[PDB]
């Protein structure tokens, strides 16, 4: 099904988001 | 099942309830980014 | 009469507990 | 071995006829079984009345015999006692009564055929099918 | 200076040989009541109709039991979860026949051990100690509560509580395995990790301290006399222990901080027993261990057995024989 | 109890008590000499229990010793349906048909012996003296009832020996497994004698109440022991359909 | 606010303790957590809806939130059949959207807003030791909590009603018109023994009592809130209690543990607030349903279910409870206090009625008993339903089992948290939470025990 | 049995009241540390 | 010594369906008997000879033909109360 593909894609987006926020805040000298 | 106008975002709905676990893990990720100070 | 044996060994255990608590070697700071 | 053609070859009628379920049909029948009948027919038993199980001898001893596909499909349309006497429509799940058995109201004739076929093929894959509740 | 104040000062006194405390004012009567009734019942109680089918079980020594087989039998299944004190029986003999001593002993025991936990906190407070010894003691308290209170509540009868005896305990475990597959429950697995690891670490810490004692004695005397109660100085070299252990495995797998080590020693078995207590407490509501019966099928659909299937055969053997006269219907629903 | 709900009697021991004819009258249920009267809700409440001690001597009188019931308020037969049949000679016949017509009861005798028995009125046929034209204070149904075995044939002893189930030998002792007479279980059918002496009749509603005295054997443990003789005294209540 | 061990004395694994006296950041942590709770409510509800099969019973689909909505009387009709999925969907979406507002506010207060509210406002600034203000906060929240209870009341009385499993003519949504205001009944419930046959407040068995309770609860909570705003803690309470943030946390942890144990028992035993048509049978119901199912079968085969003695001598199908009530035989004798809307028609004043059991059985009762018996809240951790020795083909674990097990575990670990924080609050108030001072170790000035 | 019930109720009520009035009687002050509170 | 049901098993009761003692599940083997006709037979027991299983009041044509077609599956032995008391002929505890 393309569903297992869409579920894993949404899950990958959500998984990357939080670490991405921390990474941007660390790279740009944010208030971590 | 979701109403027919929303059956599009069904794969997104199936992966939503897990996100607070990711919040708990993100606490640790941020601590590791700050070196567990 | 095995009941007597069982009660006697149990009583020995409990009496040892009593003496070990009431009459123990007093821990002293030296 | 694989799920051969002879494994899925089962009696269609009492007059000697035989039909072969496809692998898709066997899988579908298994799926409906697991979804609708296992709550009471786990491993071919009958928890609410194990005098009338899904074992091959039991299905064959009904009146008329239920060890063929068409009789099973009829039973799931109009269920009866083990002797064909008493009406069991308000007592056993069937497609003829969607008011009292809403869970079955979307199963088509092909689906009922598939679950009857699975019911007939499962006893050949397990010796403990249709046994005592604990066995 | 008032009489109530004088009594309060005596109760909370840290100079009593045995600390009493407010929690103790409850602990002492309840535990004493439980001990008296338990000893009297274990010696002399008449047989108890545990399964409520008028088939009394002899639990006491005077009725033919030995120490291993003797028990205080849980109260009748006919009672279920009903409160059954002495004053609800038409005679002490009816009370005994229906397993009243079990209810009295367990209720007083449960109250007593919760008060024991509170008392541990209380004395730590009066001694100016840190307060968490009671937290560690809450693990065995949780396990005892699971087997004597929570499991009966979930199953619906104090007859399903753990019997107060050795063979009675084994019966409980066997029946529990037959109906819940506790061996295949992950929380029991964490309990086994907790106890195996607790013993492992007890042996490891004891052996490492004993190995690293500072020379203080001669070879004619016990090395224990090299320690003096109340001494300022440490009696073993933690640095030597860490050098040995960090060479036995690798440097980073060894503790150099006694505080961190003693925390780990406390936390591991305590956490493991919390998990196992919660496991028993949740199988009280019939959320059982893993079921992998007929999980593996070949292509034709035939069942390939695994070790879980053989375990299931053992469980079925236990289940079909238990309470052999108590079931009238095909499914053991509780 | 006539106006009491389930929520008002539960947990109070009023479910094990016989109903009582309120209207204190000395009525009479008139009877045609060749008819049948149905009995709807027959209840027998046992109040006294006596067990015939067996003295070690063979010429001493046995005597009946009172016991205390170890079981609780589970001692009453109720909701029993019967018939009263009238012979041509004025004989009244009580014929219990069905209902909750048995209760296992365990009594303790002084000296620590537990005596369970199958308290029952199963298949009771009681007859009065010929010549009755009404059910009154003089009615006294006397007859025999069946006492089946206290333990069923499906029962299993602690070594899993039973009658149509279980082992037929002492499996714990393979070499001496056929030594024990208790390897053979039997469930012989016993007999009791019951008398129903009717003391109060309410003819306006067809109700009858009285006192009973029963005599029956106790449990034998699938034949493991000789049964004792149990005497049960208590009160009963019935309603006659006219 | 220090965010490291050298500045706070708290390690990273105890980092949230660094917020104890940072009221602004603490408020941010609280609002963002509330956001997590509301997010889970909305998202899990939408998951349940997307996974919901409308015709299949709710307890067969792993649902625990839609049963709560359906008990409130939204989206369901008679016997709990689903009329419209849209109300469940609406409930989920509104929680999901509000979650974002709370997340924003939390991240704002936690990250950007004032770390301490004391300076900014006298109204929102609190000191843990300021008993008047802490009681003010207790009061404002007690008034909102009582308002929520009255919201339940309003839904049950004026806004479509709630599901009454005990309704005549079958279970259905009912508008409650006469809630039990009688304080004797309402508070008598509090005074009932927590043992079999009585069940404390778990035995509440009619929506009129539940609704009258929530009118009392709303009234008492609103009154207590007003009292706490207009009063200050009295002397005895000022003397018997520890007045600190960790102390108040430990008090709330004790309360939460108590409520968790209570909720576990409630879902396990009560079928009024937790209707079996949504939550499945209680284990007591499943056992009684088994006894009943084989009562009907054997009777139909011609057995005398009244006079049939079992192998032990007790009646096979029917017996007497220790107080004499006519009850179902077998091991189910333990569940003889069970009350259920499909059983109670067959019960007379003395218990189960022979006339009713021989003439008034209905096919819906037999079907219900079969369904409840085969859905006994027994199952494995990997959701293999039925007894643990059964094979793998039945995917079912009761929602009652999930909810009861989960809330017992949470109640226990929150009791542990209460002990942890209560002992720590006591030691920290007394000044020895960090260890024993070497110079003034108390035991060095105490006499020997012997 | 009524005599025994009343005896048990009296004893239990006395012990519970003793517990409550004890932990109410300035119990936080009964420690070797700070006792101002 | 043999107990009474084991001795019964030594007789014809162990070979064929016994009209006076066999439980309702033993009639499952005859097509069209379980449950109604088996119920009526067990209800009108005992029987003195197999032939008089045809003289049960209220029996119809179908049941009479069904009984006559299976007369040779039937035997009659003395009613043993070890298989009848307590409605054991309907539910002996076997599922
Ligand atoms: C603080 C004070 C502490 C000490 C004070 C006194 C000690 C009380 C401790 C609990 C004792 C309970 C023992 C028996 C429990 C029981 O019979 O059953 C539980 C009862 C519920 O009672 C049941 O209530 C039921 C009510 O349902 C009835 O009504 C329903 C209405 O829908 C249905 O119709 C149902 O069918 C019908 O039967 C029935 O009456 C049952 O027979 C009845 O047993 O719980 C209740 O009453 C109340 C819930 C109590 C929760 C206790 C469980 C957890 C305890 C803490 C665990 C600590 C672990 C930590 C370790 C460290
Ligand atoms: C419910 C979970 C929760 C919450 C609400 C908080 C909240 C807080 N923590 Mg705690 N913490 C938690 C769990 C939690 N923590 C856990 C599990 C641990 C152990 C790892 C810690 C360990 C810890 C330490 C060690 C410290 C805190 C501190 C703090 C406070 C300052 C935060 C800060 O500056 O971080 C800055 C972090 C970042 C800037 C990284 C990004 C964080 C944002 C919020 C991510 C949000 C993403 C989200 C998807 C966006 C949605 C937007 C929109 C949709 C609404 C803050 C109030 C600090 C404190 O006490 O301050 C005095 C501190 O020192 N925490
Ligand atoms: C009160 C909490 C609660 C309860 C009762 C349930 C119950 C259920 N959920 Mg839900 N769920 C919850 C919270 C809850 N959930 C949360 C917080 C999330 C977000 C992750 C989800 C996400 C979720 C999804 C996505 C799905 C479910 C599903 C289910 C069903 C099957 C569960 C299953 O197979 O578990 C398997 C059991 C386990 C994984 C065991 C977990 C063991 C935990 C981690 C132990 C922790 C205990 C303790 C606190 C540890 C502390 C240690 C320390 C204190 C010492 C069941 C009805 C499924 C379903 O049927 O949906 C329709 C499904 O697909 N749930
Ligand atoms: C428990 C929740 C809570 C609490 C106590 C506070 C408290 C505070 N906030 Mg915060 N805030 C919150 C939630 C909360 N906020 C949320 C969820 C958001 C996201 C929208 C914000 C966003 C926010 C911003 C952006 C700012 C504040 C500011 C403030 C301060 C002044 C508030 C004000 O204007 O006076 C009182 C305000 C009012 C009386 C009007 C608002 C009342 C609300 C909006 C209506 C009722 C609430 C709700 C809709 C009804 C019930 C809720 C429901 C769940 C039952 C004060 C310390 C300000 C600050 O730091 O100043 C220095 C500031 O700049 N807050
Ligand atoms: C979450 C709600 C909440 C909270 C946190 C508080 C908190 C407080 N209240 Mg308030 N109160 C509330 C709701 C609340 N109240 C409501 C709704 C009302 C209206 C009825 C009141 C009415 C009220 C009055 C009239 C008084 C307080 C007082 C107090 C203070 C001390 C009370 C105390 O020592 O309790 C602990 C309780 C005791 C010491 C009493 C002993 C009871 C024994 C131990 C039996 C306990 C039962 C048992 C242990 C639990 C059984 C379980 C089951 C019943 C649930 C404290 C600040 C007092 C105060 O100082 O006023 C300002 C005071 O006099 N409250
Ligand atoms: C609302 C409840 C509540 C609140 C607000 C707090 C708040 C606090 N606690 Mg307490 N605590 C609570 C409940 C609560 N606790 C409970 C219920 C327990 C018993 C288990 C404890 C046990 C406890 C201890 C033992 C300690 C605290 C401490 C603290 C402080 C620092 C906490 C911190 O930074 O954690 C940081 C958070 C983490 C490190 C994350 C923990 C991760 C756990 C193991 C996961 C739990 C399982 C979870 C459900 C995930 C399962 C899924 C899995 C498959 C991945 C803070 C004041 C500390 C303290 O005293 O400071 C003064 C401290 O040492 N708490
Ligand atoms: C402070 C802090 C923290 C925390 C945080 C938090 C806790 C947060 C929260 C937050 C949150 C809580 C969030 C939320 C959000 C959400 C959202 C974003 C929403 C969205 C929605 C939507 C978009 C929807 C849609 C839809 C619809 C409408 C319908 C159906 C379908 C769908 C689903 C598609 C941590 C730990 C990290 C650490 C550091 C600090
Ligand atoms: C809604 C509802 C209802 C109602 C209910 C109610 C009415 C409630 C109430 C409740 C309540 C009424 C509550 C209470 C509580 C209590 C508690 C919880 C207490 C506690 C206490 C404490 C905690 C104390 C402490 C202490 C002590 C012990 C002494 C000294 C020291 C101190 C202070 C520490 C009903 C059931 C009808 C129905 C259903 C629904
Ligand atoms: C391929 C094998 C896989 C490797 C697995 C990796 C696991 C290691 C990650 C665990 C911790 C991660 O977060 C870790 O915390 C430390 C605390 O000492 C942080 O802090 C570190 O910062 C700098 C480097 O940036 C160091 O000079 C400093 O000595 C240290 O404090 C680091 O950012 C990171 O090393
Ligand atoms: C304060 C400390 C002392 C504790 C209190 C003492 C009271 C306890 C009484 C038991 C003492 C022995 O007294 C008596 O023992 C016999 C021996 O089994 C018991 O006898 C019981 O068991 C025997 C054999 O198992 C049976 O034959 C007998 O019928 C039965 O009643 C009596 O029931 C008991 O009354
Ligand atoms: C329930 C209500 C409990 C009221 C108990 C205290 C009454 C309040 C009167 O005011 C309080 O008096 C007590 C005496 O007990 C004093 O101490 C306090 O300084 C004061 O706060
Ligand atoms: C000192 C601290 C506080 C202590 C004060 C407590 C004193 C004890 C008072 C209550 C104890 C007695 O309470 C009383 O007990 C008898 C039991 O025989 C109960 O009696 C109950 O059961 C008996 C028989 O089992 C029935 O005859 C009666 O119909 C029923 O009400 C009463 O309902 C109860 O009111
Ligand atoms: O009691 Mn003791 O062991 Ca609990 O599961 Mn049901 O019940 Mn009886 O059988 Mn299996
Ligand atoms: Ca989906
Ligand atoms: Ca189903
Ligand atoms: Cl057993
Ligand atoms: Cl049973």
CB of E282 closer than 8 Å to CB of E193 = no
CB of F50 closer than 8 Å to CB of F229 = no
G314 Cβ below 6 A of ligand 3: no
To which H or E segment does residue F109 belong? strand F102-109
CB of F148 closer than 8 Å to CB of F190 = yes
Q: What angle do CA E259, E265, E270 make, to 5 degrees?
A: 125
CB of G39 closer than 8 Å to CB of G99 = yes
In a domain, I93, yes or no: no
In a domain, I19, yes or no: yes
E188 annotated as a binding-site residue: yes
Contact G448 C26 (CB under 8 A): yes
Q: How buried is residue E174: exposed, middle or buried, by Cβ count under 10 Å (0-12/13-18/19+)?
A: middle
Which residues are within 8 A (CB) of B31 and not within 5 positions of it... i.e. 6 or more apart? G12, G15
CB of E9 closer than 8 Å to CB of E20 = no
Which tokens go with D110? 């092909």
d(Cα E165, Cα E59) in Å, to the nearest integer?
8
d(Cα F201, Cα F140) in Å, to the nearest integer?
13
Work out the widest C-alpha separation in chain C, in whole angstroms. Answer: 50
Residue at token pair 């720590």: G424
Residue at token pair 């602004």: G24
End-to-end Cα separation, chain C, in angstroms: 50
Long-range pairs for D111-114 at CB < 8 Å and ≥24 separation?
D111/D28, D111/D32, D112/D73, D112/D76, D112/D77, D113/D25, D113/D69, D113/D73, D114/D21, D114/D25, D114/D26, D114/D28, D114/D29, D114/D32
Bridge partners of F234, per DSSP, are F46, F212
Kindly give the interhelix angle for G399-430 and E133-145, rounded to the nearest 10 degrees. Answer: 160
Closest CA to F76 of F116, F44, F121: F44
**Phi, psi for residue E165 in degrees, rounded to 5:** -175, 170
Residue at token pair 């007790």: G314
Long-range pairs for G437-446 at CB < 8 Å and ≥24 separation?
G441/E128, G442/E14, G442/E127, G442/E128, G442/H32, G443/E127, G446/E14, G446/E15
Q: Which of G420, G429, G434 to mutate to test the pocket of ligand 6 (most atoms within 8 A of CB)?
A: G420
Q: What angle do CA G353, G357, G362 make, to 5 degrees?
A: 130
Residues, chain G, total? Answer: 450
CB of F44 closer than 8 Å to CB of F145 = no
Which tokens go with B29? 């990720």
d(Cα G303, Cα D91) in Å, to the nearest integer?
20
Q: How buried is residue A14: exposed, middle or buried, by Cβ count under 10 Å (0-12/13-18/19+)?
A: middle
Which tokens go with G250? 């430990």
d(Cα E50, Cα E78) in Å, to the nearest integer?
8
Binding-site positions of G for [CaMn4O5] cluster read 331, 334
Q: How many domains does chain I have?
A: 1
Distances (CA, A) of G386 to D46, E155, E334: 13, 15, 11
CA of residue B34 to ligand 9 center, whole Å: 9
3-state SS class at F50 = strand
3-state SS class at E47 = coil
Distances (CA, A) of G42 to B8, G96, G163: 18, 4, 22
Computed over its alpha carbons, how large is the radius of gyration of chain I? 13
Pairing relationship of beta strands E71-72 and E164-165 according to DSSP bridges: antiparallel
d(Cα F124, Cα G357) in Å, to the nearest integer?
24
Of G57, G363, G385, the CB nearest to D91: G363
CB of G131 closer than 8 Å to CB of G243 = yes
Helices (H), ranges, chain A: 3-27
Which tokens go with F209? 């109440």
| Half-sphere exposure of residue E34: CA atoms within 13 angstroms, side-chain side | 18
In a domain, I72, yes or no: yes
Q: What angle do CA E39, E42, E44 make, to 5 degrees?
A: 100
d(Cα G213, Cα G209) in Å, to the nearest integer?
6
Distances (CA, A) of I67 to D63, F115, G300, I13: 15, 47, 21, 18
Q: What is the DSSP letter of F209?
A: E
In a domain, I95, yes or no: no
d(Cα A31, Cα B13) in Å, to the nearest integer?
32
Which tokens go with G449? 């025990």
Kindly give the interhelix angle for E258-283 and E186-211, rounded to the nearest 10 degrees. Answer: 160
CA H34 to chain CA centroid, Å, is 24
d(Cα E116, Cα E271) in Å, to the nearest integer?
20
Q: Which of G149, G199, G201 to mutate to test the pocket of ligand 8 (most atoms within 8 A of CB)?
A: G201
Which tokens go with G168? 């005549």
3-state SS class at F122 = coil
d(Cα F113, Cα F86) in Å, to the nearest integer?
44
Closest CA to G25 of G140, G114, G131, G141: G114
Of I43, I85, I86, the CB nearest to G302: I43
Strand ranges in chain E using DSSP code E only, listed in sequence order: 71-72, 164-165, 287-288
Phi-psi region of E57 (alpha: psi -120 to 50; beta: other; left: phi over 0): beta
d(Cα G172, Cα G80) in Å, to the nearest integer?
7
Please name the residue whose Cα sits nearest to atom 26 of ligand 7: G93
Chain F residues near residue I85 by CB distance under 8 angstroms: 148-149, 152-153, 187, 189
Size of interface E-H (CB pairs under 8 A): 44
Which tokens go with F148? 């089946």
Distances (CA, A) of F186 to E175, E215, G25, I13: 30, 78, 81, 18
Phi-psi region of G161 (alpha: psi -120 to 50; beta: other; left: phi over 0): left
Closest CA to D46 of D21, D71, D82, D8: D82
End-to-end Cα separation, chain H, in angstroms: 48
Closest CA to E255 of E241, E269, E266, E274: E241
In a domain, I32, yes or no: yes
d(Cα I10, Cα E84) in Å, to the nearest integer?
50
Q: What is the DSSP letter of F161?
A: B
Which tokens go with G57? 């019973």
d(Cα E10, Cα E25) in Å, to the nearest integer?
11
Which tokens go with F185? 């279980």
Instruction: Tell me the residues of G at the D interface, defined by beta carbons under 8 Å apart.
Output: 55-57, 81, 293, 297, 363-364, 366-367, 370, 373-375, 385-386, 389-391, 393-396
B17 Cβ below 6 A of ligand 3: yes
Bridge partners of G82, per DSSP, are G76
Computed over its alpha carbons, how large is the radius of gyration of chain C? 14
d(Cα D38, Cα D115) in Å, to the nearest integer?
12
DSSP collapsed to 3 states, chain D: CCCCCCCCEEECCCCCCEEECCHHHHHHHHHHHHHHHHHHHHHHCCCCCCCCCCCHHHHHCCCCCCCCHHHHHHHHHCCECCCCCCECCCCCCCCCCCCCCHHHCCCCHHHHHHHHHHHHHHHHCCCCCCCCCCC
CB of G349 closer than 8 Å to CB of F1 = yes
B18 Cβ below 6 A of ligand 3: yes
d(Cα E60, Cα E38) in Å, to the nearest integer?
10
d(Cα B24, Cα G123) in Å, to the nearest integer?
32
Which tokens go with G230? 């207009």
End-to-end Cα separation, chain I, in angstroms: 29
In a domain, I78, yes or no: yes
d(Cα G432, Cα F165) in Å, to the nearest integer?
69
Which residues are within 8 A (CB) of G289 and not within 5 positions of it... i.e. 6 or more apart? G281, G368, G369, G370, G371, G372, G373
Kindly give the interhelix angle for E186-211 and E238-248, rounded to the nearest 10 degrees. Answer: 130
CB of G207 closer than 8 Å to CB of G175 = no
Distances (CA, A) of D96 to D85, F86, G367: 18, 54, 16
d(Cα E80, Cα G31) in Å, to the nearest integer?
46
Q: Which atom of ligand 5 is nearest to the CA of G231?
A: 62
Bridge partners of F233, per DSSP, are F48, F213
Please name the residue whose Cα sits nearest to atom 17 of ligand 9: B35
CA G361 to chain CA centroid, Å, is 34
d(Cα G134, Cα G242) in Å, to the nearest integer?
13
d(Cα E196, Cα H1) in Å, to the nearest integer?
49
Cis before I46? omega within 30: yes
d(Cα F29, Cα F43) in Å, to the nearest integer?
18
Distances (CA, A) of E199 to E213, E249, F172: 21, 19, 38
- Work out the minimum CA distance from B29 to partner chain A, whole angstroms: 7
What is the span of the domain harbouring residue I16? 1-85
Kindly give the interhelix angle for G399-430 and G245-269, rounded to the nearest 10 degrees. Answer: 160
CB of G301 closer than 8 Å to CB of E46 = no
CB of F49 closer than 8 Å to CB of F232 = yes
Contact D7 E302 (CB under 8 A): no
Cis before I35? omega within 30: yes
Phi-psi region of I31 (alpha: psi -120 to 50; beta: other; left: phi over 0): beta
Cis before G268? omega within 30: no
Which tokens go with G90? 């609406």
What residue segments make up the domains of chain D, in order of their start? 1-135
Computed over its alpha carbons, how large is the radius of gyration of chain A? 13
- Work out the minimum CA distance from H2 to partner chain G, whole angstroms: 18
Strand ranges in E160-229 using DSSP code E only, listed in sequence order: 164-165
Residue of E nearest to I92 (CA): E328
- Touch between F and E (at least 3 CB pairs under 8 Å): yes
- Resolution of this entry, Å: 2.0
Residues, chain F, total? Answer: 242
CB of G279 closer than 8 Å to CB of G165 = no
In a domain, I92, yes or no: no
d(Cα G353, Cα F6) in Å, to the nearest integer?
11
The answer to whether E66 contacts chain D (CB < 8 Å) is no
d(Cα F36, Cα F87) in Å, to the nearest integer?
9
3-state SS class at I50 = helix
How many Cβ atoms are within 10 Å of D50's Cβ, its own excluded?
Answer: 18
Which residues are within 8 A (CB) of I62 and not within 5 positions of it... i.e. 6 or more apart? I32
Q: What is the DSSP letter of C27?
A: P
Contact I5 F187 (CB under 8 A): no
d(Cα G257, Cα G268) in Å, to the nearest integer?
17
DSSP collapsed to 3 states, chain G: CCCCHHHHCCCHHHHHHHHCCCHHHHHHHHHHHHHHHHHHHHHHHHHHHHCCCCCCCHHHCCCCCHHHHHHCCCCECHHHCECCCHHHHHHHHHHHHHHHHHHHHHHHHHHHCCCCHHHHCCCCCCCCCCHHHHHHHHHHHHHHHHHHHHHHHHHHHHCCCEEECCCCCCCEEECCCCCCCCHHHHHHHHCCCCCCCCCHHHHCCCHHHHHHHHHHHHHHHHHHHHHHHHCCCCHHHHHHCCCCHHHHHHHHHHHHHHHHHHHHHHHHHCCCCCCHHHHCCCHHHHHHHHHHHHHHHHHHCCCCCCCCECCCCCECCEEECCCCCEEECCHHHHHCCCCCCCCHHHEECCEECHHHHHHCCCHHHHHHHHHHHHCCCCEECCCCECCCCCCCCCCCCCHHHHHHHHHHHHHHHHHHHHHHHHHHHHHHHHCCCCCCCCCCCHHHHCCCCC
Closest CA to G271 of G199, G346, G356, G177: G199
């Amino acid at each position: 099904n393309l569903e297992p593909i869409f579920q894993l894609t949404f899950l990958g987006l959500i998984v990357l988001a939080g670490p991405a926020v921390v990474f941007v805040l660390a790279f740009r000298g944010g208030d971590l | 099942k979701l109403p027919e106008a929303y059956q599009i975002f069904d794969p997104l709905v199936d992966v939503l309830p897990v996100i607070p676990l990711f919040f708990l893990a993100l606490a640790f990720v941020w601590q590791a980014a700050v070196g567990f100070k | 009469m095995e009941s007597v044996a069982y009660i006697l060994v149990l009583t020995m255990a409990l009496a040892v507990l009593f003496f070990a608590i009431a009459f123990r070697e007093p821990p002293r700071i030296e | 071995v694989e799920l051969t053609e002879s494994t899925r070859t089962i009696p269609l009628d009492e007059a000697g006829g035989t039909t072969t379920l496809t692998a898709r049909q066997f899988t579908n029948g298994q799926k409906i079984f697991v979804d609708t009948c296992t709550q009471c027919h786990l491993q071919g038993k009958t928890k609410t009345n194990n005098n009338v199980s899904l074992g091959l001898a039991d299905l064959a001893g009904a009146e008329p015999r239920r060890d063929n596909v068409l009789a099973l499909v009829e039973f799931l349309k109009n269920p009866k006692s083990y002797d064909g006497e008493d009406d069991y429509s308000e007592l056993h799940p069937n497609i003829s009564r969607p008011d009292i058995y809403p869970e079955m109201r979307n199963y088509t004739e092909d689906d009922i055929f598939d679950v009857a076929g699975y019911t007939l093929i499962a006893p050949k894959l397990d010796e403990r099918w249709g046994g005592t509740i604990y066995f | 200076a008032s009489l109530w104040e004088q009594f309060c000062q005596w109760v909370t006194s840290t100079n009593n040989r045995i600390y009493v405390g407010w929690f103790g004012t409850l602990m002492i009567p309840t535990l004493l009541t439980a001990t008296t009734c338990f000893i009297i019942a274990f010696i002399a109680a008449p047989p108890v109709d545990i399964d409520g089918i008028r088939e009394p079980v002899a639990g006491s020594l005077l009725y033919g039991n030995n120490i291993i087989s003797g028990a205080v039998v849980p109260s009748s299944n006919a009672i279920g979860l009903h409160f059954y004190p002495i004053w609800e029986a038409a005679s002490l003999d009816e009370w005994l026949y229906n397993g009243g001593p079990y209810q009295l002993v367990v209720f007083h025991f449960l109250i007593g051990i919760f008060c024991y936990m509170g008392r541990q906190w209380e004395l730590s407070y009066r001694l100016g100690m840190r307060p968490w010894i009671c937290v560690a003691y809450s693990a065995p308290v949780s396990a005892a509560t699971a087997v004597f209170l929570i499991y009966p509540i979930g199953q619906g009868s104090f007859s399903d509580g753990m019997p107060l005896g050795i063979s009675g305990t084994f019966n409980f475990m066997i029946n529990f395995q037959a109906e819940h597959n506790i061996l295949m429950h992950p929380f029991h697995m964490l309990g086994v990790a907790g106890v195996f690891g607790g013993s492992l670490f007890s042996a490891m810490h004891g052996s490492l301290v004993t190995s690293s004692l500072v020379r203080e004695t001669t070879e004619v005397e016990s090395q224990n006399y090299g320690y003096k109660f109340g001494q300022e100085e440490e009696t073993y070299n933690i640095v030597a222990a860490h050098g040995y252990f960090g060479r036995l495995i690798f440097q980073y797998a060894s503790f150099n901080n006694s505080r961190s080590l003693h925390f780990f020693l406390g936390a591991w078995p305590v956490i493991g027993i919390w998990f196992t207590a919660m496991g028993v407490s949740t199988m009280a509501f019939n959320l059982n261990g893993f079921n992998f019966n007929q999980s593996i099928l070949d292509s034709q659909g035939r069942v390939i057995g695994t070790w879980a299937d053989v375990l299931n055969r053992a469980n079925i053997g236990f289940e079909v024989m238990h309470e052999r006269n108590a079931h009238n219907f095909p499914l053991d629903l509780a | 109890k006539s106006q009491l709900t389930y929520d008002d009697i539960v947990n109070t021991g009023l479910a094990n008590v016989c109903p009582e004819i309120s209207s204190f009258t000395r009525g009479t249920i008139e009877v045609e000499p060749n008819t049948k009267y149905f009995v709807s809700d027959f209840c027998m409440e046992p109040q006294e229990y006596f067990v015939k001690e067996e003295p070690v001597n063979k010429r001493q009188k046995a005597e009946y010793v009172k016991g205390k019931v170890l079981t609780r308020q589970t001692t009453s037969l109720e909701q029993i349906r019967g018939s009263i049949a009238v012979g041509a000679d004025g004989t009244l016949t009580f014929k219990e048909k069905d209902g909750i017509d048995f209760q296992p009861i365990t009594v303790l005798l002084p000296g620590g012996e537990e005596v369970p028995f199958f308290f029952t009125v199963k298949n009771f046929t009681g007859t009065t003296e010929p010549g009755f034209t009404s059910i009154n204070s003089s009615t006294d149904f006397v007859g025999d009832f069946n006492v089946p075995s206290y333990r069923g044939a499906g029962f299993l002893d602690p070594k899993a020996r039973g009658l149509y189930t279980g082992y037929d030998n002492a499996v714990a002792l393979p070499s001496a497994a056929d030594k024990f007479r208790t390897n053979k279980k039997e469930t012989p059918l016993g007999k009791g004698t019951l008398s129903l002496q009717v003391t109060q009749v309410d003819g306006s509603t067809g109700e009858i109440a009285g006192i009973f005295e029963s005599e029956q054997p106790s449990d034998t443990d699938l034949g493991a022991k000789e049964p004792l003789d149990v005497k049960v005294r208590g009160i009963f209540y019935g309603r006659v359909d006219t | 606010g220090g965010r490291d061990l050298p500045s706070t004395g708290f390690a990273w694994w105890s980092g949230n303790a660094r917020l104890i006296n940072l009221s602004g950041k603490l408020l941010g942590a609280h609002v963002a957590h509330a956001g997590l709770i509301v997010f889970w409510a909305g998202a899990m509800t939408l998951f349940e809806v997307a996974h919901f099969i409308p015709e299949k019973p709710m307890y067969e689909q792993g649902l625990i939130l839609l049963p709560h909505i359906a008990t409130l009387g939204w989206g369901v009709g008679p016997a709990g059949e689903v009329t419209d999925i849209f109300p469940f969907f609406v409930v989920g979406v509104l929680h999901l959207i509000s979650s974002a507002v709370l997340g924003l506010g939390g991240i704002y207060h936690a990250l950007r807003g004032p770390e301490v509210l004391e300076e900014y406002s006298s109204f929102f600034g609190y000191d843990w030791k300021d008993k008047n203000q802490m009681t003010n906060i207790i009061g404002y929240h007690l008034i909102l909590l009582g308002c929520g209870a009255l919201l339940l009341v309003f839904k049950a009385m004026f806004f479509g009603g709630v599901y009454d499993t005990w309704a005549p003519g079958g279970g259905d949504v009912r508008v409650i018109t006469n809630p039990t205001l009688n304080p004797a009944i309402i508070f008598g419930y509090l005074l009932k023994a927590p043992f079999g046959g009585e069940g404390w407040i778990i035995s509440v068995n009619n929506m009129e009592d539940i609704i009258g309770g929530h009118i009392w609860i709303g009234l008492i909570c609103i009154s207590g809130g007003i009292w706490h705003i207009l009063t200050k803690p009295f002397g005895w309470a000022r003397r018997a209690l520890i007045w600190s943030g960790e102390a108040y946390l430990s008090y709330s942890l004790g309360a939460l543990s108590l409520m968790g144990f209570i909720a576990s028992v409630f879902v396990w035993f009560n079928n009024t607030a937790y209707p079996s048509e949504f939550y499945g049978p209680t284990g007591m119901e499943a056992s009684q349903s088994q006894a009943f199912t084989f009562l009907v079968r054997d009777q139909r085969l011609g057995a005398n279910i009244a006079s049939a003695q079992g192998p032990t001598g007790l009646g096979k199908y029917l017996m007497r409870s220790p107080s004499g009530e006519i009850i179902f035989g077998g091991e189910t004798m333990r569940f003889w206090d069970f009350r259920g809307p499909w059983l109670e028609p067959l019960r007379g004043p003395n218990g189960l009625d022979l006339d009713k059991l021989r003439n008034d059985i209905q096919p819906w009762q037999v079907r219900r008993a079969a369904e409840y018996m085969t859905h006994a809240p027994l199952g494995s951790l990997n959701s293999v339903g039925g007894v643990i020795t059964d094979v793998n083909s039945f995917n079912y674990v009761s929602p009652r089992a999930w909810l009861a097990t989960s809330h017992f575990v949470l109640g226990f670990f929150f009791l542990v948290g209460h002990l942890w924080h209560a002992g720590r609050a006591r030691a920290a108030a007394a000044g020895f939470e960090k260890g024993i001072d070497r110079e003034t170790e108390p035991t060095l000035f105490m006499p020997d025990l012997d | 049995m009524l005599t025994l019930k009343i005896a048990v109720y009296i004893v239990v009520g006395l012990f519970i009241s003793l517990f409550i009035f004890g932990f109410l009687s300035s119990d936080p002050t009964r420690n070797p540390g700070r006792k101002d509170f | 010594e043999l107990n009474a049901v084991d001795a019964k098993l030594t007789t014809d009761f162990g070979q064929k369906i016994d009209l006076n003692n066999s439980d309702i599940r033993d009639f499952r083997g005859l097509r069209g008997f379980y449950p109604n006709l088996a119920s009526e037979i067990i209800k009108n027991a005992p029987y003195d000879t197999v032939e008089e299983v045809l003289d049960i009041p209220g029996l119809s044509e179908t049941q009479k033909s069904r009984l006559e077609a299976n007369l040779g599956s039937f035997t009659v032995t003395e009613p043993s109360i070890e298989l009848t008391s307590g409605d054991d002929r309907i539910n002996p505890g076997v599922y």
